[model samples]
Target: GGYAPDSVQIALKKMYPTAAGIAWSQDKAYYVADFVMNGFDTRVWFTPDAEWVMKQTDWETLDEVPAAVFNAFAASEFSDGVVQNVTWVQFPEWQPIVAIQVGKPNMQMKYQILFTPKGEVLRQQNITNAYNTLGASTFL
Candidate 1:
């Protein structure tokens, strides 16, 4: 019921005693936590009542990811570019989705793509290229 309180912290520690890098904060709708969960880059949410909401994990290895997401990423055109794969477990609305970050350092462009475990891109972006282009014209 109360927005933020010690009770929630007590419960979280009880559930994840060995947890490292635990961080808590409030968003418009949820209490968000981001931390290291056994070698994973983990994040979860809580309701205003402090009910456990959802969790997402970023991984250190590609082995645990679903075969579909792994293979599809290998087949991406960006496959020819640099690669970093992040994903994880526990099933639900946000379960095990993969985000593949590919950067073209020489080209000075940046990108990331989100894929469902079934190996379809949910979204992607080319965020930095335009930033460089817009600023370059003004400076030079």
Candidate 2:
């Protein structure tokens, strides 16, 4: 429900290609997000056949994950125009960690996402924020 900025079909034909592994958006599919946040632009990916959608998950628990915990990612979303505030980092320094952002307060948000490549996710040991201006610090 938190991906694609809109719908599954619309995002597939318009935003990402139809054959993407990630069914949510972003890197071409859904992710097993670790952290959860609001008011941020997110991407979703979908497969060409639409049988199964890729999702991010905790390696240990295999639970649904948020983007914040997997890789530092954020997006400035709007009704139109090239979406802003979109961040995606393939690697980070934090490892053996989980749950980056959650709950309310309108501060920092970490979103977990599901994806196609599990190996890429396995390398994710740290989680950080790409946008650190809200707190007036370089790190959020």
lDDT of 2 by residue, 1-140 (tens): 34443344543445334333333323333322223223222332244433223222223322333444333323312112221222332322323222222212243333333232222322221123544221112111
Candidate 2 lDDT (Cα, 0 to 1): 0.29
Writing each residue's lDDT as its tens digit, candidate 1 over 26-127 gives 655666666887777776666666566556677745677789987887888676666654645333343555666677778876777777889998777675
lDDT of each: 0.63, 0.29
Off by over 4 Å in 2: 1-37, 55-121, 124-140
Residue 115's lDDT within candidate 2 is 30
